[PDB]
């Protein structure tokens, strides 16, 4: 499950 927001392009989490 999601734990953080991905900074930058690619995966979002």
């Amino acid at each position, epitope marked *: 499950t*999601r*734990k*953080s*927001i*991905h*900074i*930058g*392009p690619g995966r*979002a*989490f």
Partner: antibody
Amino acid sequence: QEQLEESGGGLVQPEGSLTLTCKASGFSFSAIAMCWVRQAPGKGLEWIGCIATDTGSTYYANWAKGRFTISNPSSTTVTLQMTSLTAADTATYFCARNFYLWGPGTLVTVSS
Amino acid sequence: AQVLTQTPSSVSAAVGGTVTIKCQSSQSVYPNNNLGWYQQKPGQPPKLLIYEASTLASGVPSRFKGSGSGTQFTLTISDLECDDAATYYCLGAYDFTVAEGAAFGGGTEVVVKR
């Protein structure tokens, strides 16, 4: 081809409310984080919050919880509803996809 | 409640010189490389230079180098150019299930000497 554009800014009375809209072009949302960041005139960037476009789940800065609501009404729009506005809220408001694709910003000015 | 401390507030170097900017986080970013560096010129949105601590964004020259992990990160700008006159920001992202999801550093102004 992919772009974001903020709208809905402008002059608003102290203690008033305003809703900003962020419109995507050249793509539609597919399980991404759409985020709002602001910058007071001459100051640094300040995070407001993000929404996950598939679940509608939201994540805010502690200072912003309650007063700012991010929603996702369509596959190409997110909104930022802001209440009890104050001079400290005067700022350019940016929306961003995962902090890498940015709109040009829209100015909100809180004044009588 | 997240604290991301960016230093120095300003720095000057001549064309061809090197500038070093640091960000220190009270909590570790999550995952340990989840930090980005931005360049902002006046009247424009911030521009992503580096994400995942050290990955170059498209078109960004290699004289921009990010390093570090967890709670300590560095942006080193070498071979300085006039075009590098701008304000730079770090951004951290965190385990939002236990704390605030993100925070910007306070920014660093770069002045080009001539």
